[PDB]
Every structure is written in C-alpha cells, then in structure tokens.
Design a protein around this ligand. Structure first.
Ligand SMILES: Cc1cn([C@H]2C[C@H](O)[C@@H](COP(=O)(O)O)O2)c(=O)[nH]c1=O
Ligand SMILES: Cc1cn([C@H]2C[C@H](O)[C@@H](COP(=O)(O)O)O2)c(=O)[nH]c1=O
Lengths: 217, 217
C-alpha cells in the first residue's frame, strides 16, 4: 500500500456543468487508511450502517457563489445565493485555499481525494474554482479517485447514483442527501462495505489531481 | 444584536486540569446569528430536539498530544495517544493555528466562542495550547462565553453537566458523548432551546478571549 489518507469529498453547486456552475458547499472528511481497514467485514443481510471511524478530520464549509443557483439546485440542496450572502458566507477565495492547504497538510501523505462522480463533476469543478485563485493550488501533491469507478471495479470482480448504491447495500434511504457533509458521510458508509479491497483499488488507480482538466475556463 | 457569528466549541483532552492536560480533539461549529434567531422557539413538554441550521461551517480535528491520555479519559473519549499517532495525527502546532485563523477569517465579525464549562476548561486550555506557539494567537479579536452561565441565566428566568441539561430539556440521552463534534452538536441543540434569549445574553456577557487566563504555564 501507499495512500496514507483518503479524503472523502463532496461539493454542492449552483447547477449542472452546462450552466458553468460555482461551488456553494464543500466537505472534506479525512480518514487514515488504518481507520478504514479497522471497520469489520460487513456481515448480515442487510448489514447495519457502520459508524464512522473514531479518528477523523472533518471540514465542511458553505460558500457564496457569484451567480444564482438554478431552481432545481436550490430545491435539492436547500441553499441559495441570497441565503449564503445574508449569512455572511465568503466566496471561493485565497483564504479558502490556505484553509484547504493547512487542513491537507495535517494529513499523512500521500493523500487521495474520493468523490462520487468525481471525474465528471467534483474534481473538474474544484479545479476550475482553484484556477481562479492567485495562490498555488492546495491540491498539488494530492491524488484523486472516482468512487463510482471504484464500486464498479469491486462489484464486477443498474443505477449508480449515491442513493441507489447506499439503499442496495443497507436497505435504507440515505440521510441529508444533496448536502456536502451528508453526501460525504453517505459515501463513507458505502466505502466501509469492503474497505480493504477499496484501498487496494485506490493504490492501483489514484492519479494526480493536477492531471484533472477544469470543467470550464 | 452585535455578535454576528457564534462558534460552538468543544475540546477533548488527555485529562483533568490538575494533570496539565493536552488537547486531543477540537470541534468548531460556526453558526450565523440569523440561523439561531430563526430557529423555532421550543414549545411542548418536552419539546422536540431542534433541527440544526442548514448553513453551517464545521471544523473537527484529531490532535496527537505530547503526553498519554489517562485511562479514564481514553475510556470516555475513545481516543488514545497511541491510536492518534499510528493514524498520523499531528501536534497542536503552528500549522494548526494557521488552519484555525483561516476558518475564523471566513466568519463575519464579531465572533463569539461558545463552550460548555468553557470558563474553567475549554478556554483556558486552548489559551495554554496557543501560548506554546511562536505565531500570534488567531483567537485574539474573538469573543467567548460559557454556556453554563448562559443556561443558568435562562433556566432561572442541580447538575449543569452537558448531558444532564440535554436530558432535562429533551427527555432524551445525548448521542456521542465525550467526542468533540458530538458534544458540540449537543451544545448546539441546548442553545437552540431559547435561541433569541441565548443570543441576547451572549451579546451582553461575551468577553474577549484575550482576557482568558491560561489553564497552566
Ligand atoms: C443531482 C443533481 C445535482 N445538481 C447540481 C446541484 C448540486 O449542488 C450539485 C452536486 O450534486 P449532489 O447534490 O449530488 O452532490 O449538482 C442539479 O442541479 N440537479 C440534480 O438533479
Ligand atoms: C467528564 C470528564 C472529562 N475528562 C477530561 C477528558 C476529556 O477529553 C476532557 C473534556 O471533557 P468532555 O469530554 O466533557 O468534553 O476532560 C476527564 O478526565 N474525566 C471526566 O470525568
């Protein structure tokens, strides 16, 4: 093995890729590889939803966008530009990059970001947001992985939405859907199903986050 | 109506004040004044446990102490120096101060830290840990308040442990006791009981954190 830290990540945003979206919420959940392994091999039909590991670093932040959320985006996320602004939320700026860098620096390296549909949404969007900044990217030196690819490779060894996978494994609806922390915790639970095989796959397929093409711009 | 952000805070540590303890876990939950103001005033006996605000900044970090946790502290917190270290946790250091600074910077000012038994434990300890650092304290300019004194004023208008207050108000046991984030979320729930009245008291009684004497030298 080699990845020492897995950082489960989700974003909420103003809309879909075609609308050229801006991030409205992000959550990072850093778990050491040993904490993942030390979840039991899921047993029972269905297995109970596992508790997160005790030792965990968490960062969840709301972010004011420069453009308004779409009707459908505000509906599912429960966030709006006006509500983010009135509650004094700041934009995706240099101070946020320092925050992210300092958080990431507290983790043993190498680090791998894990996001559901990360390759098509979360990673390219995050790359676009960071490229606007004047500070060096805080995610330089870090690696990344799409959990959908992970689950597909583990499963094969129809819907692949986060909710559908979770309900298939646990026979329960996920909670706090379409919130950054809620979806991160849901993703964690899914990745605790076969953590030893997951980490093995992650070490095999982790790519530099610097190779991720920006969504736009 | 001056405090713009309330930051609910809890620490886990290696032991009791007399042992000269070190921080092992910290959680900050930043909530804008408006999110507390617009929480439903609790009605019924007992009232339901209040819903957390949608818009929230959360920071939860595990910290490797220099000295071991007491057996009793390990039992209640679920944390040990040994486990914190094997999982690559870093000390309370300069990088952590930078991380805290950047988190606080994202919050509209003036800010007020809210901690249960904060005056005797959390605030002096955090002051001691920050005093060890070469870089200036990021909490200079932030205010602080003890929620025990708050609830003593609100209730009176014998136990004041976090758990006792929660069960008295909601006729429910608190979840995830003696974990930084667990205790922060419990503290939030208690503070959402009479949130307008809590905010008014905080406005009148909040003191600069820079006036907090360190627990030990
Ligand atoms: C699933 C979905 C997401 N989105 C946008 C808004 C969300 O903040 C963002 C991230 O998706 P998520 O909520 O699955 O994490 O994508 C839509 O606009 N419509 C949709 O149906
Ligand atoms: C309540 C309690 C706390 N402590 C120490 C360990 C905890 O990490 C620290 C913070 O208290 P807390 O768990 O109530 O937040 O105080 C004890 O040593 N013994 C005790 O009985």
């Amino acid at each position: 093995g080699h990845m020492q830290t897995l950082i489960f990540l989700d974003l909420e945003a103003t809309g879909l890729p075609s609308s050229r979206p801006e991030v409205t919420e992000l959550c990072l959940l850093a778990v050491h590889r040993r904490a993942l392994e030390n979840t039991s091999i899921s047993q029972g039909h269905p297995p109970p939803v596992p508790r997160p590991p005790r030792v965990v670093d968490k960062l969840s932040l709301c972010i004011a966008p420069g453009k308004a959320c779409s009707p459908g985006a505000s509906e599912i996320t429960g966030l709006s530009k006006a509500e983010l602004e009135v509650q004094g939320r700041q934009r995706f700026d240099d101070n946020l990059a320092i925050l992210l860098r300092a958080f990431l620096q507290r983790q043993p390296q190498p680090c791998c970001l894990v996001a559901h549909n990360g390759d098509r949404y979360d990673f390219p969007l995050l790359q676009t947001e960071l490229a606007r900044l004047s500070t060096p990217s805080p995610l330089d030196g870090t690696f990344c992985v799409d959990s959908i690819a992970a689950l597909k490779a583990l499963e094969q060894a129809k819907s692949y939405s986060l909710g559908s996978i979770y309900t298939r494994l646990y026979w329960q609806a996920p909670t706090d859907s379409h919130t950054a922390e809620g979806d991160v915790l849901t993703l964690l639970s899914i990745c605790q199903w076969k953590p030893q095989a997951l980490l093995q796959w992650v070490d095999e397929h982790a790519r530099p986050f610097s190779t991720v093409k920006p969504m736009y711009g």
